[PDB]
Design a protein around this nucleic acid. Structure first.
Lengths: 298, 325, 255, 319
DNA sequence: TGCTAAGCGCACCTAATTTCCTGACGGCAATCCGC
C-alpha cells in the first residue's frame, strides 16, 4: 500500500473541498513562498505551518495519510528504523503539488476592486492554518469557539488529512464587546407602550377633549398603571413629531390646537409611551397640569 | 444555440422573510397590551421507552432516562400569542446575481417577460397570500386555537384582517378581495413594476391561558449537551425565517400525482417534502428537466409547469450545470 | 466635485455570514466594502454618479445565532440544509458544512464624492438599500439615511479601526504566535478578516462567474482591530476603511 | 405494508398546563387566594448514609451541612389550591411525522374503526376518573380532611367532586359528571370537536402551616433540592400531572395478580412496582406491528392500550 | 410664576474561631458521504 499509493496523493496547504465537499476535481494550492514577518497580516506563509496537508481522492490510496500519523510522527522525515516497501524512501517529499486549474460553483468566487476594473477572486480555504489555530488555541485562553459541524464521513470526503484529524476545529471568537450584546432589556427599550382606552369610545369625550371631570382619575390611573416602572432615558425615548399632533386633530377636525388644551401623552413619553394617535387626549390645561403633577410625584 | 445551462447560474430569494418574535397578550386587549414571552428550561425524568435490541432490553427496560429540554408556555393571565414578522418582496429578473453565459440570460429574460405577459406572477402571488391568510406559518401553534387573526400591513396601509380558521389548508381561494389586493402588489413587485415591497404580518392565536407555545428548534451540535435547544430572538421566543418561508412556499399543487395525494407540497427542485420521504417530482416533472425543455429545446410547456419553474425561481438557488473536472 | 459624508443609521442585518476559515464573529471587512461598492454600482445605474471611497463601521448590538453554554463558550447553530446541488441532490437529508451566522445593528458612515451630494442622494440610497444585502444577510429595517458634517452628529456606537501596530510589535515566533500573544495582552482586541492574497497568477480559468474578467485564486489574510467610542474618536478619517491594492495583495486598510 | 416508516412520530392529545399553587381558607375558598412561595432551608445533619467500614470510623460523628428548599402553608391558611388546565386535541390530527402515506392511511383507518366501536369513551372516562380522584396530588393527597376538585370547561363549572370518595384502583363508570365531561373529551378525541380546553381547580384541606410538596427539579452535574417555581409561586411540572392522568392501564398481562392501574408506557414500565409489565408481545411496538403491518383484529383491551399511547405520543420510528 | 446664594460632611482601632458540606440510578431513538 504505502509504496504504490504515493503517486495519487497530492500535497497542499489549500483544499477547495473544505468550503463545500461537493466541489468536483482535485483543486487546491501549495503556497511555500516566504514569511514577511512584519506585514500586518496572517497568511499561510506567515504562520508556522509545521505539518503539511496530504489530500487524496480515492479511499484506496489513503496509506500516506496513515503513515505520517503514527506517533514515535513519521513527520520526523525532515529515528531511522528501516525495512519492515522501498518506493516510500522519502517519496513523501517530492509528491505532486495540488495545483489550481479550474473553478466551480462551490468554490466561493467574489469580485474585488482593482483600479477602476474588477478581479474575480475564487477563495480557497487553508487546511494547515486551521490545524495550527486549533493546536495553538487548545493551549491558550483567548476567546474561542469550537465548530462541531463536519461529520467524519464528510471530513473523509474532503480528501484532506488535517481535516480528518481535526473535523471539529477550534477557531477565534471575534465578537463585539459584551455590553453591546442583545438581551430582552435592550429590546423592551425599543418598543413603546400604547394606552388601553380608545379615545373614540371613551364615554365622556367631546370629540377629542375630556368633557367629564371624573375621567381624569381614569386617565391618571391608566397613565400610572400602564408604564409605572418603565422610565426611559433620553436616547431610549421615542421622538416627538408634529405629524402626530396634526393627525390627532385630523381625527375630529379642530385645525388649530384648541386654546386652553394641550395634547397629553396618556402614558408619558419618559415612562414609556408611543408617539401615536392612540397615546393622546386633548385635555384642558388645568387638568393637564394636574395630571403632569400627579405623575411627577408618581 | 444554447446546449446547456451556465457554468455558474445563481438566483437570490424574492420572498425574503425575517425572523419572528413571539409575544403574549390578552384577546380583549390585543391591540394595546403586549408582554414578552420567555423560553424556560425544563428538565425531565423519563423512562427508556425507545426501541432497542432484545439483549439491551433485558438490561435497560427499567432504567431512568433523565433528559434536558427547554419549553415556552404562556402566562397564567394571558391567553393569546402574538407573532410579528416581515417580508421583503423583490423582482425576479433582478434576483439573478450570477450568470456566465449571456445568451442564457437573454433567453431566461425573454421567458420571464413572457410570463409577465400571460398571468404576470399573479396566481403564484395569490397562493403566497393564501399561505399568509390560512396561517400555515403557525406550524404546531395552529392546533387547539379558538380564534386565529392575521393582519397584513403593506407600506403603511392596514388591510382588513383574516379569519384564518375559515381557510382550508388544501384549497387555495382566488376570490377574497383583501387577498387579491395584496396579491396584485406582490405580482407587480415580482414583475419589476415595483422594485421592492415591504409586508408586515402580525398574528393573534387564542390557544388558551397557560398553554404551550412551540418555537422553532435550533440545530446545535454539542457533545456535552444534547437537549431541546429552542430559538431565542432578542431574549424572547421566535421562529426562523426558513420555517415561515417553507410554510409560504407550500403552493405546489401541480405535481404528477396530485389526484392521489391531494395536499400542497413545498416548492423544491426534485419535489422533496420533508414529511413524505419519496421525491414527488423525480424525473420528468423536475425543475432541471422542465427548464431545459423551456430554455434550451424551446417549447411551450403547460402553464402548471411554468408555474412550478417560476415558483422555483422565486425560491432561488444554485441552478447551474453538473459541474465537471 | 462635492465631498461629503452620508450616515446609514442603525441598519439591522439579519442572518449575515460569520465564518472566515478561523473566525466566528464579525464578518469580513471586504463584505461591508462590497455592500458599499454594490450601493455605488446600483446608484451609478440610476444615473447618480457617486464614488464611495471610504466606509465607517460602527457597532451597536449583536447576536451570534446560537447559545452560550454553562462553561461560558459558544455553540453556533445552523439552518437545516436543504437540496444542495451535486451527486446527492435527491436524498432527503443533506450534508452539513462549516457555517456560522450573526445578527448585527450597524451604522455605516460613507465617504461620498459626487457632483452633487444632497438629500436627494439620501432618498436614492433609501430606495437602494432595500434591494441589497450586507455580508449575506437581509436588512430588516433602517432608522434614517442622513448627511453628517463633523464628529458630533454621529450616534453613540463603537467603531472598528485597524490595529496592526499592536500585531507587528508583538512577542515573537510567527504571525499566529504574535496574534495569540497580542490577544492575550489586550483583551479588547479582535481578529478581523481584512482581505486576500493571491495563490496564483492573473489569468483565465474555466468555471468563473464572469468569463470576461480576470481571475486569481486567493487565501484570506487576517489582522487585528479594536473598538473605539464615537466620543473618543479624534479626526474621523481613521474609522474609514478603504480599498487598497498591491501586486498580489487585495487589502482593506484604514490609512 | 412492511416495516414502520423511518420517520414516524406522534404529538400529544392531552396537553396539560403547568400547575400553580395557592393558599386559601376552606370556608372562604371561593373568594380568597394568596401566593405560596418556596423557602430556602439549610439543614444540619448527621452522617446517616451507609458507609464502608473504613470510612464510618472517621465520619460517623461528623456534622453534615446540607442545602435544601421547602414549601409550607401559612399559619392562617388550611387549604392548598392547585390550578392547571388541559387542552384536548384530536388523535388523527396528531401524527407529526410519517414518511409513508400508506401507513398514514392505515393508522387513520384503524382509528376510524375504533371510533366506530368505542368513540374514545372508556379512555376518556378513565381520564376524568384520574381528574376526579385527584391523583395529580401525589404526596399532597396524604393526610387531607377534604379534597374538592372542580372542573370548568368553557364557562360552565361542573358539580364538584368528593375526591376522597374515589378508590384509586377502581374506575367509576356511573357518575353523571364524569360521563358528561368524558363524552366531550370523547368527541374531541374522535374528531367531532376540534379542541377542548378543560380547567381544573382542586382544594386540598391539609391543615395549618403544613407542608406542601412541589415538583423537584432535575440536577445533572455535581446537588441540593431545587423545587419548581412557576411564575414566582410554587408549582408542579405538567409531566407529573400527565403521568397521574395516564394511570389508566388495567390491561397488562399480569393484572389479576397486581390489581391496580399503571401509567401507559411503551414497554409497560412502572416505577412504583419495579417490574416491567409489558416487555414482550403485549408492548406497543409488537401491537402496532400486528395491527397495521400484519392486519389482525386485536382484542379491545389491546386497542385501548394502542390508542392510549397514541394519545401519549413519542418517536416510534424504525431504522 | 417665581421658589438663594457660600463654605464642607473626621481623625483610630479592627471586623473570630471548630466541625462539615449525602447516599442511588440514569442522561434516547433518526438523519445530516461524493465518487
Amino acid at each position: 500500500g504505502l509504496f504504490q499509493s504515493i503517486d495519487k496523493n497530492h500535497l497542499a496547504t489549500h483544499v477547495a473541498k473544505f468550503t463545500e465537499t461537493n466541489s468536483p476535481g482535485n483543486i487546491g494550492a501549495y503556497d511555500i513562498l516566504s514569511s514577511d514577518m512584519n506585514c500586518g497580516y496572517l497568511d499561510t506563509a506567515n504562520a508556522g505551518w509545521k505539518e503539511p496537508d496530504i489530500v487524496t481522492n480515492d479511499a484506496k490510496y489513503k496509506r500516506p495519510q496513515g503513515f505520517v500519523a503514527m506517533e514515535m510522527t513519521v513527520m520526523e522525515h525532515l529515528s531511522a528504523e528501516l525495512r519492515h516497501y522501498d518506493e516510500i524512501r522519502d517519496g513523501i517529499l517530492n509528491m505532486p503539488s495540488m495545483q489550481p486549474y479550474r473553478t466551480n460553483q462551490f468554490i466561493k468566487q467574489v469580485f474585488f476592486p482593482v483600479g477602476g476594473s474588477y478581479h474575480l477572486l475564487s477563495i480557497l480555504p487553508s487546511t494547515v492554518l486551521n490545524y495550527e489555530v486549533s493546536d495553538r488555541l487548545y493551549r491558550s485562553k483567548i476567546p474561542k469557539i469550537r465548530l462541531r459541524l463536519l461529520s467524519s464521513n464528510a471530513a473523509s470526503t474532503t480528501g484532506s488529512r488535517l481535516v480528518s484529524k481535526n473535523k471539529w476545529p477550534l477557531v477565534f471568537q471575534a465578537l463585539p464587546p459584551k455590553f453591546l450584546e442583545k438581551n430582552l432589556a435592550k429590546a423592551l427599550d425599543k418598543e413603546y407602550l400604547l394606552p388601553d382606552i380608545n379615545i373614540d369610545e371613551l364615554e365622556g369625550v367631546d370629540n377629542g377633549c375630556l368633557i367629564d371631570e371624573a375621567l381624569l382619575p381614569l386617565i391618571i390611573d391608566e397613565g400610572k398603571r400602564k408604564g409605572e416602572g418603565n422610565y426611559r432615558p433620553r436616547h431610549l425615548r421615542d421622538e416627538r413629531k408634529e405629524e402626530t399632533v396634526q393627525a390627532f386633530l385630523d381625527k375630529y377636525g379642530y385645525c388649530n390646537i384648541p386654546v386652553g388644551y394641550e395634547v397629553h401623552h396618556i402614558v408619558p413619553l419618559s415612562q414609556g409611551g408611543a408617539d401615536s394617535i392612540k397615546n393622546m387626549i386633548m385635555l384642558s390645561i388645568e387638568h393637564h397640569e394636574r395630571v403632569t403633577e400627579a405623575h411627577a410625584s408618581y | 444555440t444554447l446546449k446547456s445551462r451556465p457554468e455558474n447560474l445563481s438566483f437570490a430569494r424574492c420572498l425574503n422573510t425575517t425572523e419572528a418574535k413571539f409575544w403574549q397578550t390578552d384577546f380583549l386587549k390585543r391591540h394595546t397590551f403586549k408582554l414578552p414571552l420567555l423560553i424556560t428550561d425544563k428538565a425531565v425524568l423519563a423512562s427508556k421507552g425507545h426501541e432497542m435490541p432484545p439483549d439491551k432490553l433485558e438490561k435497560e427496560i427499567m432504567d431512568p432516562n433523565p433528559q434536558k429540554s427547554q419549553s415556552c408556555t404562556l402566562s397564567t393571565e394571558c391567553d393569546t400569542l402574538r407573532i410579528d414578522f416581515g417580508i421583503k418582496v423583490l423582482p425576479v429578473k433582478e434576483s439573478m446575481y450570477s450568470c456566465s453565459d449571456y445568451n442564457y440570460r437573454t433567453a431566461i429574460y425573454q421567458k420571464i417577460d413572457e410570463y409577465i405577459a400571460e398571468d404576470g406572477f399573479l396566481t403564484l402571488a395569490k397562493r403566497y397570500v393564501n399561505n399568509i391568510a390560512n396561517a400555515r406559518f403557525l406550524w404546531r401553534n395552529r392546533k387547539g386555537a379558538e380564534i386565529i387573526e392575521t393582519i397584513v400591513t403593506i407600506e403603511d396601509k392596514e388591510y382588513p384582517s383574516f379569519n384564518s380558521k375559515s381557510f382550508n389548508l388544501d384549497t387555495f381561494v382566488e376570490d377574497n378581495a383583501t387577498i387579491n389586493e395584496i396579491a396584485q402588489q406582490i405580482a407587480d413587485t415580482f414583475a419589476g413594476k415595483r422594485e421592492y415591497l415591504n409586508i408586515y404580518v402580525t398574528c393573534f392565536v387564542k390557544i388558551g391561558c397557560a398553554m404551550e407555545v412551540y418555537p422553532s428548534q435550533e440545530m446545535t451540535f454539542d457533545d456535552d449537551d444534547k437537549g431541546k435547544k429552542l430559538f431565542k430572538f432578542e431574549g424572547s421566543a421566535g421562529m426562523h425565517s426558513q420555517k415561515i418561508n417553507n410554510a409560504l412556499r407550500t403552493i405546489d399543487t401541480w405535481y404528477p400525482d396530485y389526484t392521489t395525494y391531494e395536499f400542497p407540497i413545498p416548492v423544491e427542485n426534485y419535489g422533496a417534502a420533508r414529511s413524505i420521504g419519496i421525491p414527488f417530482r423525480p424525473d420528468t416533472k423536475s425543475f432541471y428537466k422542465l427548464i431545459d425543455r423551456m430554455i434550451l429545446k424551446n417549447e411551450d410547456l403547460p402553464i402548471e409547469d411554468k408555474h412550478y419553474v417560476m415558483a422555483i425561481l422565486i425560491r432561488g438557488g444554485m441552478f447551474s450545470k453538473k459541474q465537471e473536472k | 466635485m462635492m465631498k461629503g459624508y452620508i450616515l446609514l443609521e442603525k441598519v439591522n442585518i439579519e442572518n449575515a455570514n460569520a465564518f472566515n476559515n478561523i473566525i466566528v464573529g464579525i464578518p469580513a471587512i471586504t463584505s461591508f466594502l462590497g455592500f458599499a461598492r454594490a450601493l455605488e454600482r446600483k446608484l451609478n445605474a440610476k444615473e447618480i454618479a457617486i464614488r464611495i471611497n471610504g466606509v465607517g463601521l460602527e457597532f451597536h448590538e449583536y447576536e451570534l445565532k446560537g447559545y452560550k453554554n454553562k462553561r461560558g463558550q459558544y455553540v453556533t447553530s445552523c439552518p437545516l440544509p436543504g437540496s444542495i446541488p451535486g451527486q446527492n441532490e435527491k436524498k432527503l437529508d443533506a450534508h452539513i458544512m462549516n457555517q456560522a451566522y450573526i445578527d448585527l445593528n450597524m451604522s455605516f458612515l460613507l465617504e461620498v464624492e459626487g457632483p452633487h451630494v444632497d438629500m436627494s442622494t439620501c432618498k436614492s440610497i433609501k430606495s437602494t438599500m432595500e434591494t441589497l444585502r450586507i455580508a449575506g444577510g437581509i436588512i430588516r429595517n433602517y432608522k434614517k439615511i442622513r448627511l453628517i458634517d463633523t464628529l458630533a452628529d454621529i450616534p453613540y456606537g463603537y467603531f472598528l479601526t485597524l490595529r496592526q501596530d499592536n500585531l507587528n510589535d508583538a512577542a515573537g515566533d510567527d504571525m499566529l504566535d504574535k496574534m495569540i500573544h497580542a490577544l492575550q495582552q489586550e483583551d479588547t482586541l479582535v481578529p478581523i478578516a481584512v482581505g486576500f492574497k493571491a495563490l496564483s497568477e492573473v489569468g483565465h480559468v474555466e468555471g468563473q462567474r464572469d468569463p470576461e474578467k480576470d481571475h486569481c485564486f486567493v487565501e484570506s489574510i487576517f489582522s487585528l482591530g479594536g473598538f473605539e467610542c464615537s466620543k473618543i474618536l479624534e479626526d474621523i478619517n481613521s474609522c474609514l476603511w478603504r480599498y487598497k491594492t498591491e501586486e498580489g495583495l487585495y487589502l482593506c486598510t484604514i490609512i
